[PDB]
Specification:
Two copies of one chain form a homodimer. The first copy, chain A, is mainly β and 91 residues long. The first copy, chain A, has a single domain (1-91), classed as 3-Layer(bba) Sandwich (Hepatocyte Growth Factor), CATH 3.50.4. Helices cover 11% and strands 43% of the residues of chain A. Chain A is globular, with a radius of gyration of 12 Å. Chains A, B: Disulfide bonds join 35-61, 39-49. Chains A, B: It comes from Homo sapiens. Chains A, B: This is Hepatocyte growth factor alpha chain.
Chain lengths: 91, 91
C-alpha cells in the first residue's frame, strides 16, 4: 500500500526546471502518500515518474520524469517543499 | 528551524504496535523539537517518518514509519506520551 518508503527524501527541497520545455504533472491531493502511490504506478502520467515534490502548503503533488541527477532539473531550497526521489533511479 | 508545527498533536497519546515485527527508531534527546526535526528530515531513519511520539518522562523520541491511519499501529492513552503526526500524511 504505502509506497512512499520507496523514496529518498530531501526536506525543504524542490526541483526547478533547467529546461523550459520540460513537462511535469500536478494535482491537489490530501496526503503525500497519494503522490507516491500515483508516481510508482505511473497512473495518469505520460512518462515514468522518477520523483515527486509535495507542496506541504498547497497539499499539491508535482510529478517529475527525471530526478536531480539529470541535466533537466536541479534541487532548490524551499520551506514548503519536500522532494522524494525513488530509490530505483538513484545512485 | 522548528518543524514541530508541521505536526498534528494528540496529547497523552502514544502509538502501540499491532504489527508484530514493525520497526521503530528511538533516541534519548533534550527536546521534542529534535524529534520533529529528525523526523521531517528522515535523518538516521531507514524509512519515511510519518509520526513520532515523545516520552515526556524519559525525554525520548519514538519515530514511526506509519501514523494511526495504518493497520500496523493505533492510538493508546498514556500520561507520559504525546503523539505528533505530520500533516503531510494526515486526512
Amino acid at each position: 500500500r504505502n509506497t512512499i518508503h520507496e523514496f529518498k527524501k530531501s526536506a525543504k527541497t524542490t526541483l526547478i526546471k533547467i529546461d523550459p520545455a520540460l513537462k511535469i504533472k500536478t494535482k491537489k491531493v490530501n496526503t503525500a502518500d497519494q503522490c507516491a502511490n500515483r508516481c510508482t504506478r505511473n497512473k495518469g502520467l505520460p512518462f515514468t515518474c522518477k520523483a515527486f515534490v509535495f507542496d506541504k502548503a498547497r497539499k499539491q503533488c508535482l510529478w517529475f520524469p527525471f530526478n536531480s541527477m539529470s541535466s533537466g532539473v536541479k534541487k532548490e531550497f524551499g520551506h514548503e517543499f519536500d522532494l522524494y526521489e525513488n530509490k530505483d533511479y538513484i545512485r
